[PDB]
Design an enzyme around this catalytic site. Structure first.
Site, short mmCIF file in Angstrom:
data_model
loop_
_atom_site.label_atom_id
_atom_site.label_comp_id
_atom_site.label_asym_id
_atom_site.label_seq_id
_atom_site.Cartn_x
_atom_site.Cartn_y
_atom_site.Cartn_z
CG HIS A 159 -0.43 0.30 2.48
ND1 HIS A 159 -0.26 -0.69 3.42
CD2 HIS A 159 0.05 1.46 2.98
CE1 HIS A 159 0.29 -0.11 4.46
NE2 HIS A 159 0.50 1.18 4.24
CG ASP A 176 -0.33 -4.03 2.70
OD1 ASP A 176 0.24 -3.58 1.68
OD2 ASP A 176 -0.65 -3.33 3.68
N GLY A 230 2.32 6.44 9.22
CA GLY A 230 3.76 6.52 8.97
C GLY A 230 4.58 5.36 9.48
CB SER A 255 1.93 1.40 7.07
OG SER A 255 2.26 2.35 6.07
N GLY A 256 4.46 -0.61 6.75
CA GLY A 256 5.57 -1.17 6.00
C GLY A 256 6.69 -1.64 6.91
C1 LIG Z 1 -4.53 5.20 7.78
C2 LIG Z 1 -5.41 4.50 6.78
O1 LIG Z 1 -5.68 5.44 5.69
C3 LIG Z 1 -6.15 4.96 4.53
O2 LIG Z 1 -6.40 3.80 4.33
C4 LIG Z 1 -6.31 6.07 3.50
C5 LIG Z 1 -5.88 7.45 4.01
C6 LIG Z 1 -4.36 7.64 4.01
C7 LIG Z 1 -3.76 7.23 2.69
N1 LIG Z 1 -4.16 5.86 2.31
C8 LIG Z 1 -3.32 4.84 2.05
O3 LIG Z 1 -3.70 3.76 1.63
C9 LIG Z 1 -1.87 4.98 2.44
C10 LIG Z 1 -0.90 5.17 1.45
C11 LIG Z 1 0.44 5.20 1.80
C12 LIG Z 1 0.83 5.08 3.12
C13 LIG Z 1 -0.13 4.92 4.12
C14 LIG Z 1 -1.48 4.84 3.79
C15 LIG Z 1 -2.50 4.51 4.86
C16 LIG Z 1 -1.94 3.47 5.81
N2 LIG Z 1 -0.69 3.96 6.42
C17 LIG Z 1 -0.28 3.68 7.75
O4 LIG Z 1 0.72 4.23 8.20
C18 LIG Z 1 -1.11 2.75 8.56
C19 LIG Z 1 -1.06 2.75 9.88
C20 LIG Z 1 -1.74 1.81 10.79
C21 LIG Z 1 -1.22 0.51 10.90
C22 LIG Z 1 -1.74 -0.35 11.84
CL1 LIG Z 1 -1.02 -1.93 12.03
C23 LIG Z 1 -2.79 0.01 12.65
C24 LIG Z 1 -3.34 1.28 12.52
C25 LIG Z 1 -2.83 2.19 11.59
N3 LIG Z 1 -3.57 3.37 11.30
C26 LIG Z 1 -4.89 3.63 11.31
N4 LIG Z 1 -5.08 4.90 11.11
N5 LIG Z 1 -3.85 5.45 11.02
N6 LIG Z 1 -2.93 4.55 11.14
C27 LIG Z 1 0.21 4.82 5.60
C28 LIG Z 1 0.23 6.27 6.11
O5 LIG Z 1 -0.81 6.84 6.44
N7 LIG Z 1 1.44 6.85 6.07
C29 LIG Z 1 1.77 8.19 6.35
C30 LIG Z 1 0.86 9.12 6.85
C31 LIG Z 1 1.23 10.44 7.02
C32 LIG Z 1 2.51 10.87 6.69
C33 LIG Z 1 2.90 12.30 6.92
O6 LIG Z 1 4.06 12.70 6.46
O7 LIG Z 1 2.22 13.03 7.62
C34 LIG Z 1 3.43 9.93 6.23
C35 LIG Z 1 3.07 8.61 6.06
C36 LIG Z 1 -5.61 5.73 2.17
#
Ligand SMILES: CCOC(=O)[C@H]1CCCN(C(=O)c2cccc3c2CCN(C(=O)/C=C/c2cc(Cl)ccc2-n2cnnn2)[C@@H]3C(=O)Nc2ccc(C(=O)O)cc2)C1
Length: 238
Positions: free
Chosen positions: A44, A93, A186, A188-189
């Site tokens: 993702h 994923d 942030g 994730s991965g």
């Molecule tokens: C958080 C889920 O969001 C989504 O699915 C949507 C909205 C965000 C973009 N989406 C993606 O698929 C997408 C694309 C690319 C990267 C990311 C996402 C969404 C998922 N993700 C997480 O880290 C997941 C966290 C996570 C993991 C577990 Cl195990 C549990 C709860 C979690 N969260 C639930 N809500 N928040 N966290 C990334 C992200 O957001 N990275 C990130 C965020 C902010 C900045 C910055 O510089 O501020 C920089 C890196 C779609």
């Protein structure tokens, strides 16, 4: 990381910070060194990433402030996404980054062991989630690598927590029933690292969850043990 603590330099030497260069350079996702030219991360992370040319991998980082224009990184030669991947919530994923150069190993950077297929039945009691992600939903990327010890959750229990989702055996969940410690934006991965018989194993890849460290909403991770053959297929190709 929610309810986390500052890591010590070299505590998680397999942890990497994956940066994007477009439009500006910034941390995109976490990742794990698994081989001398291989990073294991989440599929993702590459949504809208049109080219591996915009990616930079930094290893041996405690603080994001260690990264400037003069800081060395590894370029990505190839992005390999599981070809059954549609979205985080559906599984598969997982992604591999083939690096343009070889990672030299040392006390600052080394690979984490993949879990054994024989150890698919073992119970991991010492698991940690790490990253530079948010400390709460409305936050920002942290300077210092954070860590949190979280218990693994059974598939049965995780499925009860996610009514409306299909929690498969290719997913592995973690978190306290009461919340407070987990991955957030942030992270994730990145890895979910578990110590077993004095050896750290890459048990999961931080993937998704409803909110950050909420009560009865465990973090959902890619269950790495279920992908060892896929990883070997892509990294040991003849
Ligand atoms: C958080 C889920 O969001 C989504 O699915 C949507 C909205 C965000 C973009 N989406 C993606 O698929 C997408 C694309 C690319 C990267 C990311 C996402 C969404 C998922 N993700 C997480 O880290 C997941 C966290 C996570 C993991 C577990 Cl195990 C549990 C709860 C979690 N969260 C639930 N809500 N928040 N966290 C990334 C992200 O957001 N990275 C990130 C965020 C902010 C900045 C910055 O510089 O501020 C920089 C890196 C779609």
């Amino acid at each position: 990381i929610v309810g986390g603590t500052a890591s010590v330099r070299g505590e998680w030497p397999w942890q990497v910070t994956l940066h994007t260069t477009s439009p500006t350079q910034r941390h995109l996702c976490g990742g794990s060194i698994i081989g001398n030219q291989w990073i294991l991360t989440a599929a993702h992370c590459f949504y809208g990433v049109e080219s591996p040319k915009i990616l930079r991998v930094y290893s041996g980082i405690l603080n994001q402030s260690e990264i400037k224009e003069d800081t060395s990184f590894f370029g990505v030669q190839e992005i390999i996404i599981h070809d059954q991947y549609k979205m985080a919530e559906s599984g598969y994923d997982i992604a591999l980054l083939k690096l343009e150069t070889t990672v030299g190993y040392g006390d600052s950077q080394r690979p984490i062991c993949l879990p054994s297929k024989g150890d698919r039945n073992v119970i991991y009691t010492d698991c940690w989630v790490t990253g530079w992600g948010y400390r709460k939903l409305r936050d920002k990327i942290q300077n210092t690598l954070q860590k949190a010890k979280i218990p693994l959750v059974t598939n049965e229990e995780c499925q009860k927590r996610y009514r409306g989702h299909k929690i498969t055996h290719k997913m592995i969940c973690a978190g306290y029933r009461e919340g407070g410690k987990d991955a957030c934006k942030g992270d994730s991965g990145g890895p979910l690292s578990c110590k077993h018989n004095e050896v750290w194993h890459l048990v999961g890849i931080t993937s998704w969850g409803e909110g950050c460290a909420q009560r009865e909403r465990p973090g959902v991770y890619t269950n790495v043990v279920e992908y060892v053959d896929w990883i070997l297929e892509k990294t040991q190709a003849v």
